[PDB]
Write an enzyme that holds these catalytic residues in place. Structure first.
Site, short mmCIF file in Angstrom:
data_model
loop_
_atom_site.label_atom_id
_atom_site.label_comp_id
_atom_site.label_asym_id
_atom_site.label_seq_id
_atom_site.Cartn_x
_atom_site.Cartn_y
_atom_site.Cartn_z
N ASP A 179 0.82 -1.21 0.00
CA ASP A 179 0.00 0.00 0.00
C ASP A 179 0.86 1.26 0.00
O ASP A 179 0.47 2.27 -0.59
CB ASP A 179 -0.96 -0.01 1.20
N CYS A 213 -2.56 -0.47 -13.76
CA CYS A 213 -2.67 -0.35 -12.31
C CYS A 213 -3.99 0.38 -12.03
O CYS A 213 -5.02 0.07 -12.65
CB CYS A 213 -1.45 0.38 -11.74
N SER A 214 -4.00 1.35 -11.12
CA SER A 214 -5.21 2.15 -10.98
C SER A 214 -5.31 3.19 -12.09
O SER A 214 -6.35 3.31 -12.76
CB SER A 214 -5.27 2.85 -9.61
N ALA A 215 -4.25 3.97 -12.27
CA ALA A 215 -4.23 5.03 -13.26
C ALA A 215 -3.54 4.62 -14.55
O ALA A 215 -3.65 5.33 -15.55
CB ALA A 215 -3.54 6.27 -12.69
N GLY A 216 -2.82 3.50 -14.53
CA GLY A 216 -2.09 3.06 -15.70
C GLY A 216 -0.85 3.85 -16.01
O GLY A 216 -0.50 3.99 -17.19
N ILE A 217 -0.16 4.39 -14.99
CA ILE A 217 1.06 5.15 -15.24
C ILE A 217 2.17 4.81 -14.26
O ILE A 217 3.33 4.66 -14.66
CB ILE A 217 0.79 6.68 -15.25
N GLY A 218 1.85 4.67 -12.97
CA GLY A 218 2.86 4.44 -11.96
C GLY A 218 3.44 3.03 -11.97
O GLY A 218 4.52 2.78 -12.53
N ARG A 219 2.74 2.09 -11.35
CA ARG A 219 3.18 0.70 -11.41
C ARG A 219 3.22 0.19 -12.85
O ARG A 219 4.10 -0.61 -13.20
CB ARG A 219 2.29 -0.16 -10.52
N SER A 220 2.29 0.64 -13.70
CA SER A 220 2.30 0.19 -15.09
C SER A 220 3.58 0.63 -15.80
O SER A 220 4.17 -0.15 -16.56
CB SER A 220 1.07 0.74 -15.83
N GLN A 276 5.61 7.07 -11.12
CA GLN A 276 5.03 8.17 -10.37
C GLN A 276 5.87 8.62 -9.18
O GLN A 276 5.54 9.64 -8.58
CB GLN A 276 3.62 7.81 -9.89
O1 LIG Z 1 -1.79 2.63 -9.53
C1 LIG Z 1 -0.75 3.30 -9.79
O2 LIG Z 1 0.44 2.80 -9.69
C2 LIG Z 1 -0.91 4.75 -10.19
O3 LIG Z 1 -0.23 5.27 -11.11
N1 LIG Z 1 -1.88 5.46 -9.46
C3 LIG Z 1 -2.19 6.83 -9.62
S1 LIG Z 1 -1.51 7.95 -10.48
C4 LIG Z 1 -2.36 9.23 -10.13
C5 LIG Z 1 -3.39 8.92 -9.18
C6 LIG Z 1 -3.26 7.38 -8.86
C7 LIG Z 1 -4.16 6.58 -7.87
O4 LIG Z 1 -4.12 5.31 -7.88
O5 LIG Z 1 -4.93 7.21 -7.02
C8 LIG Z 1 -4.35 9.93 -8.67
C9 LIG Z 1 -4.31 11.29 -9.26
N2 LIG Z 1 -2.99 11.67 -9.78
C10 LIG Z 1 -2.30 10.69 -10.58
CL LIG Z 2 4.96 12.73 -13.44
#
Ligand SMILES: O=C(O)C(=O)Nc1sc2c(c1C(=O)O)CCNC2
Ligand SMILES: [Cl-]
Ligand SMILES: [Cl-]
Ligand SMILES: [Cl-]
Ligand SMILES: [Cl-]
EC number: 3.1.3.48
Length: 299
Positions: free
Chosen positions: A186, A220-227, A267
């Protein structure tokens, strides 16, 4: 190969000992491409976006084969030198699960890579878009698709599911593999880079990343961080095997190349650091290094 691994371990140590992860990450954010996302920001697509600050660039967005509305929050990352393509998308929404599987069907994907849990930190990060029970299949009425869980293989760090996706119009069926990394913490990054490299190898070994299928779908959730972490490590590992001397791979350069296709990939500076570790560990396993044979055995 050997030289690529040496240079990257060297660069990792250089950055780590100087504590430069944050500055490097902020440089990446500053240099990152900025392209328009006009279709994503149309008023009619507001309910198709999970986060108002995460949108696909127009030039690389995936289009549904729809006459009414072809929009989905998904981007094609096309890595020219590495010869790999990935579709990165947000976690589907209650009203976009049919779109998600329509995209999987139309793009001829074989694998879906999920890097999050449906619930995290007490909130919903992703719709339950696949069936959890063999006997309770799902029908997506808006796109005329049926989805059945065939089997699942629950490991300690990840789960692999065999799914059958059926186009109800034509009655063709396809086997879709769901690769679910279920232990991303988390807060922070996974304690075991080897478990993430190992997860990547399981995705690779299924054929889901191979040119004979459409691009793998990663989220992932947003498709940028873990993705971003997943695709960055895969592409960097590939490049480490194909370059002549100089064989070194510049992770910052690869990440900036990927950010031409979707905003915000990776991220946190911690995620950037973690990407290095997963690549370094994965390369050691690929090269048959005996030191990593050990803790890899309880995996
Ligand atoms: O799931 C991820 O790794 C990821 O990029 N999550 C992201 S990136 C991102 C958010 C989230 C979220 O999950 O709340 C919220 C708003 N700003 C960008
Ligand atoms: Cl960024
Ligand atoms: Cl509109
Ligand atoms: Cl889950
Ligand atoms: Cl490079």
């Amino acid at each position: 190969g050997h030289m690529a691994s040496m240079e990257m371990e060297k660069e990792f140590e250089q950055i780590d000992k100087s504590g430069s992860w944050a500055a490097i990450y902020q440089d990446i954010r500053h240099e990152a491409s900025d392209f328009p996302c006009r279709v994503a920001k149309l008023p009619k697509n507001k309910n198709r976006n999970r986060y108002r600050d995460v949108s696909p660039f127009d030039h690389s967005r995936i289009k549904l084969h729809q006459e009414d509305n072809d929009y989905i929050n998904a981007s094609l990352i096309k890595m020219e030198e590495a010869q790999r393509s990935y579709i990165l998308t947000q976690g589907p929404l209650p009203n976009t699960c049919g779109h998600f599987w329509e995209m999987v069907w139309e793009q001829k994907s074989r694998g879906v890579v999920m890097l999050n849990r449906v619930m995290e930190k007490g909130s919903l990060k992703c719709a339950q878009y696949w069936p959890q029970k063999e006997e309770k299949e799902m029908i997506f009425e808006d796109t005329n698709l049926k989805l059945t869980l065939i089997s699942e293989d629950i490991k300690s760090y990840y789960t692999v599911r065999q799914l059958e996706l059926e186009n109800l119009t034509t009655q063709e069926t396809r086997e879709i593999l769901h690769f679910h990394y279920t232990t991303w913490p988390d807060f922070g990054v996974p304690e075991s880079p080897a478990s993430f490299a190992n997860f990547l190898f399981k995705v690779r070994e299924s054929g889901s990343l191979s040119p004979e299928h459409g691009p793998v779908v990663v989220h992932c959730s947003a498709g940028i961080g873990r993705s971003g972490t997943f695709c960055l490590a895969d592409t960097c590992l590939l490049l480490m095997d194909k370059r002549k001397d100089p064989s070194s791979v510049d992770i910052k350069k690869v990440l900036l190349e990927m950010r031409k296709f979707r905003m915000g990939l990776i991220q946190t500076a911690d995620q950037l650091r973690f990407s290095y570790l997963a690549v370094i560990e994965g390369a050691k396993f690929i090269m048959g290094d005996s030191s990593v044979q050990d803790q890899w055995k309880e995996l």
